[PDB]
Amino acid sequence: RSLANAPIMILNGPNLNLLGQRQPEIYGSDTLADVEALCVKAAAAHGGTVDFRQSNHEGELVDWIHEARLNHCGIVINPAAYSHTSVAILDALNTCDGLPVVEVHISNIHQREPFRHHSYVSQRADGVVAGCGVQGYVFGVERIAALAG
Amino acid sequence: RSLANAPIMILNGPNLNLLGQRQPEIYGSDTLADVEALCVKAAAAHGGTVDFRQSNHEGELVDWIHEARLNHCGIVINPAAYSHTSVAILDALNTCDGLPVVEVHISNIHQREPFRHHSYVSQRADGVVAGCGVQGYVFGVERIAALAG
Amino acid sequence: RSLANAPIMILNGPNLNLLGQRQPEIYGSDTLADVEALCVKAAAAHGGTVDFRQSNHEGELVDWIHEARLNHCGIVINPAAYSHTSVAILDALNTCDGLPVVEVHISNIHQREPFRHHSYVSQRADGVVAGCGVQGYVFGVERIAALAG
Amino acid sequence: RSLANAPIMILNGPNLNLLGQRQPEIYGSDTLADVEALCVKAAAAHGGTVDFRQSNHEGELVDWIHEARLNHCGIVINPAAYSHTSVAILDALNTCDGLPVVEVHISNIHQREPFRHHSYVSQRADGVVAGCGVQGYVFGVERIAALAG
Amino acid sequence: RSLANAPIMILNGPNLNLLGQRQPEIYGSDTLADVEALCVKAAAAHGGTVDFRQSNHEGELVDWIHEARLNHCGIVINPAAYSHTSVAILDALNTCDGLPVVEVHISNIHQREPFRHHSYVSQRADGVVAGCGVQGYVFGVERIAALAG
Amino acid sequence: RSLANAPIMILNGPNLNLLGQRQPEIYGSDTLADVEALCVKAAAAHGGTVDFRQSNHEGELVDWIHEARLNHCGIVINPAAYSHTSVAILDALNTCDGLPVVEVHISNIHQREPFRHHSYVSQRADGVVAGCGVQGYVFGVERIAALAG
Amino acid sequence: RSLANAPIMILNGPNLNLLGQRQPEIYGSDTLADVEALCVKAAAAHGGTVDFRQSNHEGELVDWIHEARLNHCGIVINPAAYSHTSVAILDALNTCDGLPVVEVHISNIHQREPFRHHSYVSQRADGVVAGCGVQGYVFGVERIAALAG
Amino acid sequence: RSLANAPIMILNGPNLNLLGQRQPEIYGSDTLADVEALCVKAAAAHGGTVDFRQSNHEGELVDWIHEARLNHCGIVINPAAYSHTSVAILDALNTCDGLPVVEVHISNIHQREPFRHHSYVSQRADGVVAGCGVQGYVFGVERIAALAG
Amino acid sequence: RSLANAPIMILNGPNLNLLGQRQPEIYGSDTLADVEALCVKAAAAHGGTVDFRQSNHEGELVDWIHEARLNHCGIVINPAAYSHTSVAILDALNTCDGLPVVEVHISNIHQREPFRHHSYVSQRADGVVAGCGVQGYVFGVERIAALAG
Amino acid sequence: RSLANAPIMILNGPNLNLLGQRQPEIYGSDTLADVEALCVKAAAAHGGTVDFRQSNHEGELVDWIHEARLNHCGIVINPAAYSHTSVAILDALNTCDGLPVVEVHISNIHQREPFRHHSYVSQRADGVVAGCGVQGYVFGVERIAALAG
Amino acid sequence: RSLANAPIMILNGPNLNLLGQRQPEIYGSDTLADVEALCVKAAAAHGGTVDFRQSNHEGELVDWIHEARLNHCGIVINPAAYSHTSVAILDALNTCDGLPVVEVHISNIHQREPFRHHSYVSQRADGVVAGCGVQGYVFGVERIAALAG
């Protein structure tokens, strides 16, 4: 499946629904909607499309990964807190044999608490982008573009 | 948001629906309905109300936290098993800037298995009560009362 | 409750819906439906029945465990990835006093990554069967048969 | 020994003599004297009395626990630093067969340095209250009132 | 080699010679002889035979594994204590290229002491059966019968 | 201070002089020359220039870090093996107060050996990009442009 | 200093004054007064005397060690909880160059909680006796007699 | 079986056949024949006898424990190296229900390499004596005497 | 408080009263009195005085720390064994807001046993001087004079 | 003992009987017989002899080490699996005062499973050769020749 | 050999060249030139001289240590980052038999990140001075002066 043939799946994990609605001062101002638009743009430039979703539920993300698996040209995923706990998410991505996956984190997890330093997703992800702000999602889109074609 | 303005959210994690229905001998005789009533009563003494919920799903508890964040004056939470596994509930509670939070554990988790000794929730909670029985929910209510007022 | 009174609950964790639809070469060719057929046949030989289910959601697995506790004669469970992460599913199983429970892994988890070597379910499970293929579910049913009678 | 029969021992560890005399801004303003009053008041509501003490010496706290054993209806203890270091006081409490014991920490030790995360006293404490401020000693007295009657 | 061509080697580690004879007198408990009789019948159901042995000596077990490598159709092994200490027994099993191996533990080693949670045999064994009682041996014979044919 | 004022330092650690001259089959085909060219172009798009350097010496990398501190508008660094051992390069970066740093790894270090899972530089870098191939350098550059402007 | 010259110092750490006054059923019936009398008799058999003491205070124990060092022919110590926490007692014992020291525990600490498995006193003690009951204190005396002569 | 009924088995582990034959200067001068004579003497005094044995084989020590289990009044054991590696001898000792057992080490193993600090035998042994020299075996005989009567 | 206003408190932990009285060969010849003289002279060179004390009691060292906090210009402390165990002395020193504190060890603790490598005092002390012999006390006083003025 | 006075003992641990008989492709083709011949030739060149043995039994290797201590000029040992498990072999080599000992491993243990990275034998062995194939035994004999000469 | 014969070598590891040029507010104002001046002064007072150097290169530091070994009377060293990572610098100091060495840290490393708590140099250094500011360099020169004379 190519970029032209199918969309890029963009998945966002728990609490990301509240992006840019917390402390517009300490946290950014961009919202999940601003982020999605960043993706549409980025994908468009390469003649591609995206399919942008967010969920707080472990199992629902598993379901979307299976859908991606059969119907999408790659996955850009920010597992958010499930990055550090979900073997389930990791196993679902392991079934996507041959599919480009890029993992993205808005903040530099490596500067945070020690329990965030490890990500189950990072053993399957082809690339991992961390602490590049919302710009990481564009980087994620571009990397899929390159890999997918 | 005050105790008179809005209710206190009392969230209950997995398996607590079966409270008191196991071995009325080794475990208590009190039910989730008994706990709810202990909470309604303790809050009425301070002129407030509660909104009492239980779920076995992590993401649903996350959703309820986001709810509380905009609509309630505090959170009493017994995360049960998710206490030890849920970075997602911790992140959820972290979006509740300025909102009092008290963690309650019926049993004394420090006397149980080592995996029970750590809670992700305790690093955000203002207070943690453990091993005081269902009475610890009344404590949790009293504390929310003092912080909110 | 006997094998003649109530069915055996067989529960399957995340990702098992894709069983046998991956790399029919590296991975087997039996589907979840094949497995369910195998369990019905083994139960029938003992004059019993099975109730066969699968879910990607941790909370839904817990609910099904609560049900079994009141309506089934035993549990055969492949927690998949949740074996390694879910304290919740263990505490659910822990309410099943006196009920037989056998944990089954299709692959030998002890030959894979160190994080799969530990299962929370194995401390409640009466028996644990790993790396015996889909045949391990038949062994599960026979064990339940023997414990239930 | 009942609440109407004998006093509640309230024991306070090292450095607590300086409670509220440090930085009235970052630390509270309540003193060990204000806490005793809170304690006396809570216990009078249930028709009981308190015996309130404080010492910097491990051995002296061990001496006071042996006394409680013969003269008191229960123990509310804030071991302070000795929580993390004193097997001696754990062992002293262990000789108090069937005596209600509640452990209190004014601050939420779970948010402090890792060495403060474990307490030897918690494995004997019937309950543990941390992070509830000086109000925690109130909860302590209440819990003892419920256990002792 | 087929079951028709050669027996299944059933190896029993140290202390198993005392199976079922610990005091006082629990009626109807199985002895090592009982297990041998169960094994003979299980293999006969599939047209096969068994060569059932037991040893207290690490080195003899190794010798018997070398024997099986050339004369037997598969191995069922209850290494007992040696499961946790014998790299030598694993290294012997590793010389048995292609040969089927199933490790059997009568008790659920995962509910006992932490040192018994790891088995060296388990990294070679094709399948591991724990805490299915003496019935686990019959599961071990059935698995060999399926891998052999 | 800015992209138009001063160049971007791009620093390459040890063994990167051999980029693309190894097994043009298992490893890429692009050379450091190519990468440098990728960087020049990305920079030019934003009207900036790069100052691309490589070295096998820990101290030389420190020296170079101090130079960027006074004469460059940001740093992109791939410290290669020194990511996991070099506290001195971390401390050098730490002197570069307010200067944007981005760490690039060609390969996904989280999929490799455990000793490569930690990087000292990661606790100073604003962002970290791993496993996106040479393309990550370009990301590094694009991010420096954004932080710089 | 010989056995005929000076007494054997017998020292007893915290909580041991309560020996035999707990659960005459689960714990022994023997009191510290019974122990002292066994020590006197043993030491007499060898023409020696004893100086038997108990304290709940770390520092007083260090004081008596310093006394023994100059006035006694040996030390039998049961340090109780201080075995596991007291570097100070170990340092005190360290200044007693050439002096025979025997450590005694009534119960088999190796069968208890993991934190009682380690003893600071044991790297200095010539002999360690554990789980031999109060008779162990007689073993202690006899070893001193043999070491002093 | 009493002391007047049956002998005390005294088992000796590997390499002890060379006791006192090494560096009569840095190691003692007593031999295994001298230790045997001490034990016969100590036992006779209480009207008992001993069966004194040494082997370098793990398996033979397990055989002998099985023999003691039925024919002897208790076990004094110095497992030497096998103290630190043998689950099999621990498990043998575990079958000897109600049989008194004392562990003896000549040297104080707690002053040697960390790997000698843990003994598998210590979790079953009623008493452990260490670094009391050959006299420890006399201590062991005396402990059995008191335990058998 | 200035050096001209109040004395420097010089506190010495357990076993230091025996300084120089041990092996005048392996250990020095300087006594605690000699050390006190050295401290008077160092303070005097800066116009100041010292208040020199030693105790084998944890809780007394705390009392004296509380005393210094209100009556002295600084602390020089050789905690001895309590450096490795005393969270209480650490907490006492933490109440000394803005008071200069220096920690002194006569021997280089980093060359001794691993339990001696960590000091609780060092996380509060402004400086730590180790292995500089009794001269280290002089350095201590000189540092307090510099920080005090 | 020189090389002219006594043979060099070459000892081979468990499973080495099967040397060269497994997968002549993945494993070598050399057998234990080929190795002995390499060893006889190397010893002759230096005017000595060898005494070449192989056993699967820990305690026999122990017996043979005792023998060598009296009868041989040195020991060249390939402990195979017992390298990682036998404190008993180590204790045997330790009684061999003044005797040269070289440890040999055909494969480079440092590149296999982590439990293979440690050898109890390496802490007594004068030298350790690994990963140099059967040629490593030649080095072994050469090193003994240089030490015994 | 002596302070009069030869200079004191003073070495400074990486990034120390920037000393006092960072944030004159959070960090001191003294430069490496100011430190060299304090050292000269302090040595002159004892009729000695100093040879003050700084390097970012591990290997150059080793070369200077070799030099001092034959041409200097002692070493005062602030290894900076290399303290925590340089086995090579430790090994070079270890060649300097009988030569006095004092390690000095400007900040109290014990209060920073856990990877800074350990120094390879402290196992060789006779004394270690930390968190005494640039004054720690003066203490070092004094210690050297006392040790050299």
Place this chain on the structure above:
Amino acid sequence: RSLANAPIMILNGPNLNLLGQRQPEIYGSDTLADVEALCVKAAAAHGGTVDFRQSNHEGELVDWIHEARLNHCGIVINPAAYSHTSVAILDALNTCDGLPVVEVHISNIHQREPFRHHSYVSQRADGVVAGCGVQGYVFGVERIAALAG
């Protein structure tokens, strides 16, 4: 490349320049010039040559490793302290596809401090020789001869 075609590179890490110049009594008398001779000598017997180099600088060893990769027929390397610390020397060796590498340590590193137990270079080296003295470099030259031809 062959032994006839190209030299064997023999690389020596830090501090080995002082080999035989320390304590001729505790350390050998052999110098790096003597080791070099033993290398030339061993290579000549097989018709080959050597290129013998020593450096204190990590990055210089890495440069030399690149050099060997294109011009030499193998590497024998004694990385000295960098064995334990240098991931960059490891990575250099990994670029040398198909080239025989042997690590040599003069001393038996397994008998010294724990930090010396692990070598990064051992995971790439074909063979590792330790504690065989300077003779080890001879074994290393021969192994290179055997693998190169």
